[PDB]
Amino acid sequence: GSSGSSGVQDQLPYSVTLISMPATTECRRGFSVTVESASSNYATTVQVKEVNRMHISPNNRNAIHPGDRILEINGTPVRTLRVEEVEDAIKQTSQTLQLLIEHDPVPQRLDQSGPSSG
């Protein structure tokens, strides 16, 4: 009922994020998204291309960010929401835009050169 994503049981840690902001301040949205369909017509995967902290806000700016992956939009599975659907949702510039970002515990894969010499 409440939650559910091909796995009700509990395994390994995880931190989910949810951002619910009203419209996008008129005009066009503030951030762009990527739609992958592999070799089909519907959606298969969504990724955050660009994101503006000014167009959005210092509140949802922490939750969302460029590089993450949108699991659900407005409270719906993108893995099922046809491309047009995944895009239309964004077009909505007069309604509460909900974005569910997934945050993993694992550390950020950075370089591999610490403080040399001792």
Swiss-Prot record:
Superkingdom of this protein's organism: Eukaryota
Subcellular compartments: Cytoplasm, Cytoskeleton, Spindle; Cytoplasm, Cytoskeleton, Microtubule organizing center, Centrosome
Domain PDZ positions: 18-105
Modification(s) after translation: Phosphorylated on serine and/or threonine residues by ROCK1.
Modified residues (Phosphothreonine): 76
Function of the protein: Serine/threonine-protein kinase that plays an essential role in the regulation of actin filament dynamics. Acts downstream of several Rho family GTPase signal transduction pathways. Involved in astral microtubule organization and mitotic spindle orientation during early stages of mitosis by mediating phosphorylation of TPPP. Displays serine/threonine-specific phosphorylation of myelin basic protein and histone (MBP) in vitro.
Family designation: Belongs to the protein kinase superfamily. TKL Ser/Thr protein kinase family.
Subunit annotation: Binds ROCK1 and MARF1. Interacts with NISCH.
Annotated protein name in UniProt: LIM domain kinase 2
Organism whose genome encodes this protein: Mus musculus (Mouse)
Covered residues, full protein: 142 to 246 of 638
